[PDB]
Every structure is written in C-alpha cells, then in structure tokens.
Amino acid sequence: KEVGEVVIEGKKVKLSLFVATLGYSRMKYAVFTTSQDQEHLMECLIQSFKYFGGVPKKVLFD
DNA sequence: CCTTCTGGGGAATTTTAAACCGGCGATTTTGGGGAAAAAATAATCGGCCTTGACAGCTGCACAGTAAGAGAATTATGCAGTGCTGCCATAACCATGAGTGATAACACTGCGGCCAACT
C-alpha cells in the first residue's frame, strides 16, 4: 500500500505499508518501509513468518 | 287257510346336459400410397424495460530483466607483390560442308508528280 510521501526527520521518503493476512484465522501482520525492493519484500515475508510462528503452504501475491 | 298285492334290487336302456374341438364367417391389422393438417423449429419483427455514460485527460513512478544502440578493440579474410613452372592456345595447311550470293520473274513498298479543295 503506497501510503505516500512524507517528510520524516526532514527527509522526503515514499512510505509503503506491507500487509500479510492469514486466510483461515484472518490474522494480520503489517510493517512500514521506505522501499519496495525484492530485498524488502523478502525481509517483510520473514517478519510475517516469524510473527505467525510458521510458514504457510501457499502465499498469494499480485 | 289260501290267494293276491306290493316293495326292493340288479341289469338294461335312453335322454339331456355339458365340454371340447373343428369349421365357417367377420372384423382387425399390417403394409403401401396419397393427401391434408398439425406442430415444431427457426428466423425475423416490433417494442418495452433498464442502465451506462457524458460529464478536461492520462502520463508518469517503481520494480526487474532483457534487449539494443553506439563506440572501442580484435580477428580474419582479401588483396597485393615477387619468382618460377606448367598448360593452354594459337598458328599453319589440308579437306569437307554450309551459307551467302547470283540470276530471273512477281509482287509490293516508297518517292516523284499531278490534281482537287480550302
């Protein structure tokens, strides 16, 4: 979710929100980031998997 | 005391009712042909009901990978030059065969001359 552009600490950055929703329990993990690079995507997925205490058997992206 | 009447039983015969089987007369059913009607299917027509769009417009940003465009560098194929050797061709003479030429008549093409119209 591209939140928009904000002046954080006098620096203009493009804030983005990463959301991971479980399908059966409808849990929700989220985290804010300054970039949408493959590295950031993979790290946010690691954070989601740690938060849910495991990895799913299927993950749906766009 | 005796005679006659009657009744029962076994055998023979007759009639009528019932059931089967066959024969005869009638209707039904199957097949084919021709006509008529119904229904099914497809196409075409009119019209009602409902809603999308028209409201400035869409170009840019990011993500990743791949392609490509331009310039520099490298590899390679062509070309150029010299020296030596071998093969091709060409030059001459003879003989045979093909075609270009020559004579004659007939038909046609081109240039010179005459006349008619504007």
mmCIF file of C-alpha atoms (C1' of nucleotides) in Angstrom:
data_model
loop_
_atom_site.group_PDB
_atom_site.id
_atom_site.type_symbol
_atom_site.label_atom_id
_atom_site.label_comp_id
_atom_site.label_asym_id
_atom_site.label_seq_id
_atom_site.Cartn_x
_atom_site.Cartn_y
_atom_site.Cartn_z
ATOM 1 C CA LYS A 1 0.000 0.000 0.000
ATOM 2 C CA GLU A 2 1.733 3.170 -1.195
ATOM 3 C CA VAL A 3 0.920 5.470 1.724
ATOM 4 C CA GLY A 4 2.511 8.477 0.042
ATOM 5 C CA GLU A 5 5.368 10.918 0.518
ATOM 6 C CA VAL A 6 6.146 12.243 3.998
ATOM 7 C CA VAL A 7 8.871 14.442 5.485
ATOM 8 C CA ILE A 8 10.275 12.114 8.147
ATOM 9 C CA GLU A 9 13.108 13.814 10.052
ATOM 10 C CA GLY A 10 13.389 16.464 7.356
ATOM 11 C CA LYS A 11 13.774 13.801 4.653
ATOM 12 C CA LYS A 12 11.200 13.094 1.953
ATOM 13 C CA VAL A 13 10.639 9.345 1.644
ATOM 14 C CA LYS A 14 7.965 7.263 -0.071
ATOM 15 C CA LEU A 15 6.273 5.348 2.731
ATOM 16 C CA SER A 16 4.817 1.934 1.920
ATOM 17 C CA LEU A 17 2.805 -0.491 4.029
ATOM 18 C CA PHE A 18 3.317 -4.246 3.746
ATOM 19 C CA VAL A 19 0.336 -6.356 4.832
ATOM 20 C CA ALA A 20 0.259 -10.134 5.348
ATOM 21 C CA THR A 21 -3.152 -11.682 6.052
ATOM 22 C CA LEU A 22 -3.661 -15.307 7.023
ATOM 23 C CA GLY A 23 -6.509 -16.996 5.194
ATOM 24 C CA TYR A 24 -8.133 -19.233 7.814
ATOM 25 C CA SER A 25 -7.622 -17.225 11.027
ATOM 26 C CA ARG A 26 -7.695 -13.797 9.328
ATOM 27 C CA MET A 27 -4.646 -12.698 11.307
ATOM 28 C CA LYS A 28 -2.936 -9.511 10.166
ATOM 29 C CA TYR A 29 0.734 -8.565 10.274
ATOM 30 C CA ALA A 30 1.870 -5.232 8.887
ATOM 31 C CA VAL A 31 5.032 -3.164 8.670
ATOM 32 C CA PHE A 32 6.075 0.173 7.201
ATOM 33 C CA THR A 33 9.035 0.557 4.859
ATOM 34 C CA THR A 34 10.737 3.145 2.661
ATOM 35 C CA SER A 35 11.176 0.924 -0.413
ATOM 36 C CA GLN A 36 9.513 -1.929 -2.279
ATOM 37 C CA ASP A 37 12.667 -3.741 -3.382
ATOM 38 C CA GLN A 38 12.772 -7.534 -3.583
ATOM 39 C CA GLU A 39 15.060 -7.442 -0.549
ATOM 40 C CA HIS A 40 12.486 -5.501 1.468
ATOM 41 C CA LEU A 41 9.731 -7.828 0.268
ATOM 42 C CA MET A 42 11.649 -10.925 1.349
ATOM 43 C CA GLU A 43 12.545 -9.385 4.713
ATOM 44 C CA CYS A 44 8.919 -8.456 5.366
ATOM 45 C CA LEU A 45 7.937 -12.019 4.494
ATOM 46 C CA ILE A 46 10.495 -13.262 7.033
ATOM 47 C CA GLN A 47 8.979 -10.940 9.623
ATOM 48 C CA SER A 48 5.475 -12.200 8.817
ATOM 49 C CA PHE A 49 6.537 -15.846 9.067
ATOM 50 C CA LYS A 50 8.213 -15.203 12.412
ATOM 51 C CA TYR A 51 5.130 -13.334 13.629
ATOM 52 C CA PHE A 52 2.764 -16.177 12.703
ATOM 53 C CA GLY A 53 5.165 -18.768 14.131
ATOM 54 C CA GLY A 54 5.402 -20.632 10.838
ATOM 55 C CA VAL A 55 5.208 -20.540 7.063
ATOM 56 C CA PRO A 56 2.023 -21.237 5.058
ATOM 57 C CA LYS A 57 1.667 -23.886 2.389
ATOM 58 C CA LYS A 58 0.620 -21.230 -0.151
ATOM 59 C CA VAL A 59 1.252 -17.490 -0.450
ATOM 60 C CA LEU A 60 -0.774 -15.290 -2.800
ATOM 61 C CA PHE A 61 0.701 -12.129 -4.318
ATOM 62 C CA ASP A 62 -0.265 -9.859 -7.167
ATOM 63 C "C1'" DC B 1 -106.071 -121.421 5.371
ATOM 64 C "C1'" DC B 2 -105.118 -119.730 0.587
ATOM 65 C "C1'" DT B 3 -104.716 -116.029 -2.744
ATOM 66 C "C1'" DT B 4 -103.266 -111.503 -4.270
ATOM 67 C "C1'" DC B 5 -100.952 -107.175 -3.734
ATOM 68 C "C1'" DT B 6 -96.717 -104.662 -3.139
ATOM 69 C "C1'" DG B 7 -91.802 -103.485 -2.497
ATOM 70 C "C1'" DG B 8 -86.708 -103.960 -3.099
ATOM 71 C "C1'" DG B 9 -82.691 -104.892 -6.033
ATOM 72 C "C1'" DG B 10 -79.841 -105.852 -10.096
ATOM 73 C "C1'" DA B 11 -79.469 -105.218 -15.040
ATOM 74 C "C1'" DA B 12 -80.586 -102.953 -19.336
ATOM 75 C "C1'" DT B 13 -81.713 -98.951 -21.790
ATOM 76 C "C1'" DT B 14 -82.488 -93.620 -23.025
ATOM 77 C "C1'" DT B 15 -82.132 -88.912 -22.879
ATOM 78 C "C1'" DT B 16 -80.122 -84.430 -21.998
ATOM 79 C "C1'" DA B 17 -76.670 -81.635 -20.426
ATOM 80 C "C1'" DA B 18 -72.039 -80.317 -20.506
ATOM 81 C "C1'" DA B 19 -67.429 -79.705 -22.583
ATOM 82 C "C1'" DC B 20 -64.132 -79.936 -26.454
ATOM 83 C "C1'" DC B 21 -62.745 -79.384 -30.891
ATOM 84 C "C1'" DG B 22 -63.344 -78.069 -35.506
ATOM 85 C "C1'" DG B 23 -65.247 -75.332 -39.130
ATOM 86 C "C1'" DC B 24 -67.008 -71.137 -41.005
ATOM 87 C "C1'" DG B 25 -67.870 -66.017 -41.267
ATOM 88 C "C1'" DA B 26 -66.406 -61.465 -39.735
ATOM 89 C "C1'" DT B 27 -63.512 -57.979 -38.208
ATOM 90 C "C1'" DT B 28 -58.898 -56.347 -37.496
ATOM 91 C "C1'" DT B 29 -54.407 -55.356 -38.632
ATOM 92 C "C1'" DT B 30 -50.441 -54.604 -41.436
ATOM 93 C "C1'" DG B 31 -48.396 -52.628 -45.461
ATOM 94 C "C1'" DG B 32 -48.122 -49.196 -49.063
ATOM 95 C "C1'" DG B 33 -49.575 -44.912 -51.350
ATOM 96 C "C1'" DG B 34 -51.547 -40.146 -51.381
ATOM 97 C "C1'" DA B 35 -53.287 -36.013 -49.189
ATOM 98 C "C1'" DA B 36 -54.035 -32.910 -45.519
ATOM 99 C "C1'" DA B 37 -53.260 -30.923 -41.247
ATOM 100 C "C1'" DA B 38 -50.738 -30.006 -37.141
ATOM 101 C "C1'" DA B 39 -46.766 -28.956 -34.797
ATOM 102 C "C1'" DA B 40 -42.146 -27.945 -34.293
ATOM 103 C "C1'" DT B 41 -38.300 -25.214 -35.257
ATOM 104 C "C1'" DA B 42 -36.000 -21.383 -36.844
ATOM 105 C "C1'" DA B 43 -35.840 -16.747 -38.286
ATOM 106 C "C1'" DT B 44 -37.432 -12.186 -38.298
ATOM 107 C "C1'" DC B 45 -40.142 -8.243 -36.423
ATOM 108 C "C1'" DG B 46 -41.679 -4.683 -33.155
ATOM 109 C "C1'" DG B 47 -41.412 -2.795 -28.794
ATOM 110 C "C1'" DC B 48 -40.803 -2.401 -23.839
ATOM 111 C "C1'" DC B 49 -37.512 -2.016 -19.895
ATOM 112 C "C1'" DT B 50 -33.486 -0.775 -17.920
ATOM 113 C "C1'" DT B 51 -28.926 1.389 -17.244
ATOM 114 C "C1'" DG B 52 -24.349 3.228 -18.589
ATOM 115 C "C1'" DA B 53 -22.055 7.459 -19.747
ATOM 116 C "C1'" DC B 54 -21.441 12.098 -20.693
ATOM 117 C "C1'" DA B 55 -19.502 14.974 -17.734
ATOM 118 C "C1'" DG B 56 -10.768 18.070 -19.249
ATOM 119 C "C1'" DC B 57 -7.218 13.897 -19.983
ATOM 120 C "C1'" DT B 58 -3.626 10.233 -18.960
ATOM 121 C "C1'" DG B 59 1.150 10.181 -18.141
ATOM 122 C "C1'" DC B 60 4.117 9.042 -15.153
ATOM 123 C "C1'" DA B 61 6.794 6.050 -10.984
ATOM 124 C "C1'" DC B 62 8.777 1.800 -9.477
ATOM 125 C "C1'" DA B 63 10.156 -2.971 -9.945
ATOM 126 C "C1'" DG B 64 13.104 -6.411 -12.547
ATOM 127 C "C1'" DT B 65 15.037 -8.342 -16.605
ATOM 128 C "C1'" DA B 66 16.317 -8.304 -21.221
ATOM 129 C "C1'" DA B 67 17.469 -6.044 -25.494
ATOM 130 C "C1'" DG B 68 19.692 -2.867 -28.173
ATOM 131 C "C1'" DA B 69 22.380 1.122 -29.712
ATOM 132 C "C1'" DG B 70 26.875 3.225 -30.068
ATOM 133 C "C1'" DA B 71 31.898 3.021 -29.677
ATOM 134 C "C1'" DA B 72 36.283 0.758 -28.983
ATOM 135 C "C1'" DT B 73 39.024 -3.438 -29.838
ATOM 136 C "C1'" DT B 74 40.321 -7.652 -32.048
ATOM 137 C "C1'" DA B 75 40.379 -11.419 -35.733
ATOM 138 C "C1'" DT B 76 40.301 -12.597 -40.040
ATOM 139 C "C1'" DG B 77 39.850 -12.531 -44.969
ATOM 140 C "C1'" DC B 78 41.030 -10.134 -49.036
ATOM 141 C "C1'" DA B 79 44.493 -8.120 -51.611
ATOM 142 C "C1'" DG B 80 48.978 -7.018 -53.190
ATOM 143 C "C1'" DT B 81 53.773 -8.270 -54.886
ATOM 144 C "C1'" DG B 82 57.664 -11.202 -56.394
ATOM 145 C "C1'" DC B 83 59.601 -15.587 -58.680
ATOM 146 C "C1'" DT B 84 59.235 -19.943 -61.002
ATOM 147 C "C1'" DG B 85 56.966 -23.710 -63.655
ATOM 148 C "C1'" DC B 86 53.366 -25.825 -66.482
ATOM 149 C "C1'" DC B 87 49.454 -25.949 -69.530
ATOM 150 C "C1'" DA B 88 46.760 -23.900 -72.993
ATOM 151 C "C1'" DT B 89 46.194 -21.768 -77.251
ATOM 152 C "C1'" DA B 90 47.391 -20.302 -81.435
ATOM 153 C "C1'" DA B 91 49.335 -20.537 -85.836
ATOM 154 C "C1'" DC B 92 49.600 -23.042 -90.435
ATOM 155 C "C1'" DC B 93 47.911 -26.400 -94.031
ATOM 156 C "C1'" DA B 94 44.510 -29.572 -95.974
ATOM 157 C "C1'" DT B 95 39.666 -31.115 -96.959
ATOM 158 C "C1'" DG B 96 34.781 -31.132 -96.434
ATOM 159 C "C1'" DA B 97 30.280 -28.791 -95.779
ATOM 160 C "C1'" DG B 98 27.258 -24.985 -95.054
ATOM 161 C "C1'" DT B 99 25.555 -20.370 -96.262
ATOM 162 C "C1'" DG B 100 25.815 -16.159 -98.579
ATOM 163 C "C1'" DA B 101 25.407 -14.874 -103.083
ATOM 164 C "C1'" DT B 102 23.652 -14.508 -108.096
ATOM 165 C "C1'" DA B 103 20.164 -14.902 -111.995
ATOM 166 C "C1'" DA B 104 15.149 -14.316 -113.096
ATOM 167 C "C1'" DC B 105 10.368 -13.419 -112.526
ATOM 168 C "C1'" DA B 106 6.444 -11.358 -109.464
ATOM 169 C "C1'" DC B 107 4.639 -8.747 -106.172
ATOM 170 C "C1'" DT B 108 4.850 -4.800 -103.161
ATOM 171 C "C1'" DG B 109 6.883 -0.508 -100.963
ATOM 172 C "C1'" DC B 110 8.491 4.266 -101.408
ATOM 173 C "C1'" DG B 111 9.329 8.568 -103.735
ATOM 174 C "C1'" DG B 112 8.077 11.866 -107.529
ATOM 175 C "C1'" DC B 113 4.337 14.103 -109.820
ATOM 176 C "C1'" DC B 114 -0.406 15.730 -110.809
ATOM 177 C "C1'" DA B 115 -4.861 17.406 -109.322
ATOM 178 C "C1'" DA B 116 -8.652 18.845 -106.188
ATOM 179 C "C1'" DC B 117 -10.374 21.572 -102.226
ATOM 180 C "C1'" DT B 118 -9.998 25.401 -98.887
#
